[PDB]
Amino acid sequence: RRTDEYILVRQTGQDKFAGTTKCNLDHLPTKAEFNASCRLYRDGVGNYYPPPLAFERIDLPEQLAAQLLEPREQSKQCFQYKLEVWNRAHAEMGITGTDIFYQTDKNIKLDRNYKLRPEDRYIQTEKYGRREIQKRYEHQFQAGSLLPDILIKTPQNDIHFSYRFAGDAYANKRFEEFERAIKTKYGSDTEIKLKSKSGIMHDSKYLESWERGSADIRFAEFAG
């Protein structure tokens, strides 16, 4: 097992957050602490998934989805299939607060493509502009739908968090420059994650292996 297979994130302010990596925890968190945090799970390339996405990243069989029409019993049969995969993973990681945080915000109605209306798909920060999201959750912090743009994880597994804004210290500067100043400050083994609209924090090198310059595209976009 990896020492950084999860990170526990907490809110400490208006648009302010702190994280601790599994191996840096000074105590064994209770189920309450586990359930109040945003829990980030490391996948096979060092992307980090918050709970409702780590859970839905499990997948269902073709012949099982066609045969299923109903509606609300539709939510209960999908859940029991993934719950056994999920439970078996939490047990191995030692996590006792295993809430998923899938519950949707029920004041919000979808358009015919089963997606958010444009007026419902933004979070407002106090100082940093708006950010687009994929889904409206009843528990927005725990679901991962409230994190900053940038997660830095140093060689000691310490977490630093950052927001871009229009005209900040890196305005019209390239991701690779930010990257070089990060590894100068922290060590060249430092990891940088860049947040997806879903809440996923994709590792910067994973993004570049997918398409050269993707890390930079995502970095620029946070600042408009």
UniProtKB/Swiss-Prot annotation:
Q: How does it assemble?
A: Interacts with host VIP2 that promotes T-DNA integration into the host genome. Forms a complex made of virE2 and host proteins VIP1 and VBF. Forms heterodimers with the chaperone protein virE1 that prevent virE2 anarchic homopolymerization. Interacts with A.thaliana VIP1 that mediates its translocation to the host nucleus. Forms a complex made of VirE2, host VIP1 and VIP2 and single-stranded DNA (ssDNA).
Subcellular localization is given as: Secreted; Host nucleus
Q: Which organism is it from?
A: Agrobacterium fabrum (strain C58 / ATCC 33970) (Agrobacterium tumefaciens (strain C58))
Protein's job: Involved in DNA transformation; mediates the nuclear uptake of single-stranded DNA copies of the transferred DNA (T-DNA) element. Binds single-stranded but not double-stranded DNA regardless of nucleotide sequence composition.
Q: What name does this protein carry?
A: Single-strand DNA-binding protein
Induction pattern: Targeted to degradation by the host proteasome by VBF and Agrobacterium virF in SCF(VBF) and SCF(COI1) E3 ubiquitin ligase complexes after mediating T-DNA translocation to the nucleus.
